[PDB]
């Protein structure tokens, strides 16, 4: 009957929020493009409290972590190429002839380099791939670099490695990462088995298109994830149970000559052909791909009803868009992934699929324009050993569904992995009625009001407290300190100098909640209660501040006389 407001600090409550997370690298230097120095060392053992009774709603397609990863990887890519040589004096008209052998793919190009010595003009010979070389005239021998006229071409430093390294994202103080531990999760929906993690699992930022290379696999069955499943033109991420294997080789052996540009800067180019001119023939085991296509078309028939499903190749066009593109060995491959999607299923030649591939050195990454990167050639054969881990399918009318290898920007290459994780902002302050007057972190979040009110200590303890990454981290830490001082000042103005639980003695009106203490301190989670009194939060807070502290302060001011 005689109920009073009591303020509880450290409540296991949260709401959806978007922030910047700290990148952490495995403890395990190589100057790898995604800099190790930027990212903190990983904790030796992660903690994964298995939140019980918590059924949170996840949605891969509205997830700020994916966009944050896109921005972070773009920033790290640009910063890694910042101090490397810029190929400004190489737009010169190139006299090119076909290499005497593929046919016409490699061009023997002569050009006059005018070095910074400025008393010589050196005629030099170099080999360029056909994809990077475009005509400039009706003369069949005069060409230029493909994108050097509308962009500044940055040469990648040969000392930068492109080998994938697992990168974790760890929550800052004041936020939490909730992981969905289900096995057949469909990306968008409620999750029945939720845990809280400080950092995510190892994520290899593999860059590829039409197909996801390396990474985690499904545990129960092949999982097909799409936001709507009927609008079309929405990537149908496919995660597999068993991994096919993309063995890929570039047979040709090449020698890398260097040409001075300025004092301490060099353009690394292709010297001459050693051995015969072969082609890059990626080998995929046909039987295994058969099985994978079966285990995918079954699920697609389940989702799209028993229609005939046809896997077609992508629509024709320029090689960069249409063809699959590895990041293996430091050489950018573009493979004609047509034999893999050439089947009608409804309801015999060879045993290995050989995909031809073309190597390209001048590239435009992240779908940007006006910027371009030159990858210097690698001496010797390149022998990949990748693992088929996922597919990206897109849809296009006689009762047949046409699926094609499609995809999108690199965000869709990480929705396939960060589909079991969500970032949540925690608001530790809450209020509840009591009779008085003046496990791990969120482990009791799904528990009732009673017996969750005994664990605020851990949540209160663990909730709070150079360069571009530096400034972002400084802004994040300052914001966290701000939040913490917001909470502490709210507690101070409420007369709770240092009391996780502080009784107010403000009367508990019956227009907020009419439920009795038994039905308020049991039968409900802190989430349902915080939602319930959401509208009255401002009013209640006002009453805790105005009605008491002021009056209590005046009273104590009047007690010493």
């Amino acid at each position, epitope marked *: 009957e005689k109920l009073w407001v009591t303020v509880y600090y450290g409540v296991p409550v949260w709401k959806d929020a978007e922030t910047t997370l700290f990148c952490a690298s495995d403890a395990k230097e190589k100057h790898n493009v995604w800099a190790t120095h930027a990212c903190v060392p990983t904790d030796p053992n992660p903690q994964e409290v298995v939140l019980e009774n918590v059924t949170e709603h996840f949605n891969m397609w509205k997830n700020n972590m994916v966009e944050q990863m896109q921005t972070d990887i773009i920033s790290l890519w640009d910063q890694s190429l910042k101090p490397c040589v810029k190929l400004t004096p190489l737009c010169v008209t190139l006299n090119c002839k076909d290499v005497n052998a593929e046919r016409g793919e490699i061009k023997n190009c002569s050009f006059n380099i005018t070095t910074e010595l400025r008393d010589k003009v050196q005629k030099v010979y170099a080999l360029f791939y056909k994809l990077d070389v475009v005509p400039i005239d009706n003369n069949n021998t005069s060409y230029r670099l493909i994108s050097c006229d*509308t962009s500044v071409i940055t040469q990648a430093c040969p000392k930068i490695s492109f080998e994938p390294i697992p990168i974790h994202y760890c929550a800052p103080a004041g936020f939490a990462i909730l992981k969905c531990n289900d096995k057949t999760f469909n990306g968008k929906g409620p999750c029945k088995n939720v845990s809280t993690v400080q950092c995510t699992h190892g994520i290899r930022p593999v860059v590829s298109t039409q197909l996801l290379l390396n990474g985690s696999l499904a545990e129960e069955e092949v999982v097909i994830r799409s936001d709507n499943f009927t609008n079309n033109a929405k990537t149908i991420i496919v995660q597999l149970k068993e991994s096919v294997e993309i063995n890929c080789t570039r047979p040709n052996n090449y020698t890398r000559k260097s040409i001075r540009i300025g004092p301490g800067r060099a353009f690394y180019t292709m010297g001459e052909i050693i051995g015969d001119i072969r082609q890059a023939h990626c080998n995929i085991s046909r039987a295994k791909w058969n099985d994978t296509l079966k285990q995918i078309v079954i699920k697609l028939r389940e989702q799209f009803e028993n229609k005939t499903i046809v896997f077609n190749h992508s629509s024709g066009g*320029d090689p960069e868009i249409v063809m699959h593109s590895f990041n293996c060995g430091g050489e950018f491959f573009y493979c004609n992934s047509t034999q893999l999607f050439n089947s009608t299923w409804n309801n015999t030649e060879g045993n290995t699929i050989t995909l031809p591939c073309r190597i390209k050195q001048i590239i435009n990454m992240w779908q940007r*324009v006006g910027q371009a990167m030159y990858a210097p050639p690698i001496r010797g054969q390149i022998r990949c050993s990748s693992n088929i881990t996922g597919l990206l399918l897109t849809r296009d009318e006689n009762g047949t569904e046409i699926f094609r290898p499609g995809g999108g920007d690199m965000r869709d290459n990480w929705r396939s992995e960060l589909y079991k994780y969500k970032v949540v902002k925690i608001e530790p302050l809450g209020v509840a009625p009591t009779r008085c007057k003046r496990r791990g972190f969120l482990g009791a979040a799904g528990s009732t009001m009673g017996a969750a009110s005994m664990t605020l200590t851990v949540q209160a303890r663990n909730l709070l407290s150079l360069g571009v990454w530096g400034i972002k981290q400084l802004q994040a830490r300052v914001l966290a300190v701000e939040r913490y001082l917001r909470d502490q000042q709210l507690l101070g103005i409420w007369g709770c100098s240092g009391k996780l639980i502080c009784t107010t003695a403000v009367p508990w009106n019956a227009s907020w909640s009419n439920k009795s203490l038994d039905r308020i301190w049991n039968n409900m989670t802190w989430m349902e209660w915080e939602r319930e009194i959401d509208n009255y939060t401002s009013e209640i807070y006002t009453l805790i501040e105005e009605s008491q502290n002021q009056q209590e302060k005046n009273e104590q001011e009047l007690l010493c006389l």
Partner: antibody
Amino acid sequence: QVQLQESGPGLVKPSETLSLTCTVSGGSIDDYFWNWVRQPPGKPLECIGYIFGRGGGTKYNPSLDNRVTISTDTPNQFSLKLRSVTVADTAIYYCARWNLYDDDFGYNSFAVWGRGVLVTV
Amino acid sequence: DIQMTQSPSSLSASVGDTVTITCQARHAVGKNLNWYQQKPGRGPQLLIYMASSRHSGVPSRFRGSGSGREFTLTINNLQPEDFATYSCQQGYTYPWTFGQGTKVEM
């Protein structure tokens, strides 16, 4: 205040050469791609080709089987030549200015369009 | 080439309502999208460039945003002068394909 005006015949029979001339008023030709585009009835706008500056590099929509040639005739007039015109080529033809520079409005967009001339077959 | 589609193919609206037009690319184009306005008897006018930047002199009411293959143009407080055919264009690969076009009716 750069304005573009197309001119040329409004009727060309099949298989001869279709000739159009875009004249630039207000300002002289400058280092922006000058582009010919068309809109057939009931179809989206289709890029035909472009030329850079006063004589220079060109590029043409690959899916035309090299039937198109573009060149500059006068410091404020450039022209489109389209060979082997067929009945499918009836369209409203526009000349447009495509910007190359990100320090001005309309980066990578047809900032300036002409009125457009309807050519049938 | 890269096929572009947009939705709805046509819609009706009155003065003062908000209109949303979705442009979908068959392949990712980054932020390199432009929005054009076409009226009878007049050449196309540029409304938005690089998918979120309004061109000089364009009314503030026109708002456009998106990334990857997905973009949306929102016209708030529809004016009688804004009834026109709106189209989206890419900018990444040449030819920069346009789109079917949405006609805004009274």
